[PDB]
Amino acid sequence: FQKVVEQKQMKDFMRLYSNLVERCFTDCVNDFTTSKLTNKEQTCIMKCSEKFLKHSERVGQRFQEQNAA
Amino acid sequence: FQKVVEQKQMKDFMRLYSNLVERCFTDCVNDFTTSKLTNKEQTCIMKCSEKFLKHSERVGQRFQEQNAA
Amino acid sequence: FQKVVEQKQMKDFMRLYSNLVERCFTDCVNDFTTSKLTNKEQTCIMKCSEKFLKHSERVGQRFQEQNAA
Amino acid sequence: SQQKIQAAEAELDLVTDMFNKLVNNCYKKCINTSYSEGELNKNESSCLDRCVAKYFETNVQVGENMQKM
Amino acid sequence: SQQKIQAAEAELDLVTDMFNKLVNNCYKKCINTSYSEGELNKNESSCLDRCVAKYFETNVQVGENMQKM
Amino acid sequence: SQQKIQAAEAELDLVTDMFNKLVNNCYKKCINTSYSEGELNKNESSCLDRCVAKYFETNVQVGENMQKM
């Protein structure tokens, strides 16, 4: 199909988002004395978000190059 | 669909059960000098089962509250 | 279905292969000063491949016995 | 649109997946099994509430981070 | 019933998933890769049998625990 | 063949799954989050390239190992 691709693409996007959320929650949120993110936890999530998306971008680029071969 | 929900619900149930089995096997069964669960391993699995289902229950409750918002 | 089985079987095979690749990459490839596997990394992957397939074979055998009961 | 309903499958897909990551994540953040008794104690109980809450706060946070870049 | 056959997809779904958890679980419980040689030794071999067995025993056990509550 | 196209679902299935293992694997091999800053540094960047490369080299390697036995 092609319709599968559009769906698979949607599922793929829902993937990153999810994995990203989980990645950054695991590395940044360690205090549960409250129900809200501190200042530090948001910054940490900011950096984690960036680092992960960048990393995820780079690997995607290499993945395409080596994929054509 | 609605039929998907009933199926998704079935898949969801098969999920917990599986994750529960894996959770408790990992934390309780560490002796393999025999092929049968000792007395202690069953109790451990009893407590693990309870703790996990409870935990899983609580999170589900919070998940519904924060989900409506 | 039966068609599902043939598909599920295909998905299953794609599973091992993938899990095997991941298993052996995680345990064997730890040097990234280059872009190619050293001599040692290939051997390690050779042994890992074997050990895993064997392990995977044995568990499959037991899985069938205990499954009939 | 028939395929549009695919959204239910897609959405309920991410809703189920997220809930599962939530369950597993918050277990690691809040549950101590060492010499524990099947009951979910008060401290574990509140940790969960706050954990589930920060997880959603993290979602939005990470959601706004992807929207920025 | 056409949708009833969905059971095959649902069942074979849990059968495949369980088998995979089994494979990964028992690997961690029984396999030592440190300075190991691609062959699956006797001790690793029996550990597997007993591991696969206790895993099923754990299934039923956990199954009876959910039936209680 | 309509079912033959299932190959696209099957292939793109393994392509997506592999890419995700790749992303997660190479993150663990190359990313250090300790006191890190959201930017992906040069050393992390090249590690990724070489990591992605050895991962494909590992695929083929593991592919030839299964072909042998």
Cβ count near B9 (within 10 Å): 12
Nearest to A49 by CA among F39, B60, B66: F39
Asked whether at least 3 C-beta pairs link C and F within 8 Å, the reply is yes
Percentages of chain B per state (helix, strand, coil), in multiples of 5: 75, 0, 25
Nearest to F29 by CA among F53, F47, F5, F14: F47
How far from the centroid of its chain's Cα atoms is residue E45's Cα? 15
Q: Are F13 and A24 in contact (CB under 8 A)?
A: no
Q: E47 at the C interface (CB within 8 A)?
A: no
Contact at CB, B18 and E14, closer than 8 angstroms: yes
Per DSSP, helices labelled H in chain E are 6-30, 42-68
Helix E42-68 and helix E6-30, axial crossing angle in degrees, nearest 10:
130
Nearest CA in chain B to E52: B35
The domain of F27 spans 1-69
CATH of the domain at F46: 1.10.287.810
The CA distance from A54 to F37, in Å, is 12
Strand, helix or coil for residue A24? helix
In the PDB record, what is the listed experimental method?
Answer: X-ray
Contacts of D26 in chain B (CB under 8 A): 55, 59
**DSSP letter for each residue of D10-68:** HHHHHHHHHHHHHHHHHHHHH---TT--SS--HHHHHHHHHHHHHHHHHHHHHHHHHHH
**Which phi and psi (to 5°) does residue E65 adopt?**
-75, -35
Contact at CB, A52 and F20, closer than 8 angstroms: no
- List domains and CATH numbers for chain C: 1-69 (1.10.287.810)
Resolution (A): 2.5
How far from the centroid of its chain's Cα atoms is residue F38's Cα? 22
The CA distance from C43 to C51, in Å, is 12
Pick from A5, A47, A66: which is nearest to F38 by CB?
Answer: A47
Find chains touching chain D: ≥3 CB pairs under 8 Å.
Answer: A, B
Q: How many domains does chain D have?
A: 1
Nearest CA in chain E to B8: E10
The CA distance from A62 to F52, in Å, is 7
Question: Residue E11: CB partners within 8 Å, gap ≥ 6?
Answer: none
Q: Are B65 and D55 in contact (CB under 8 A)?
A: no
CB proximity under 8 Å: C 7-46 to E: 8, 12, 15, 19, 27, 46
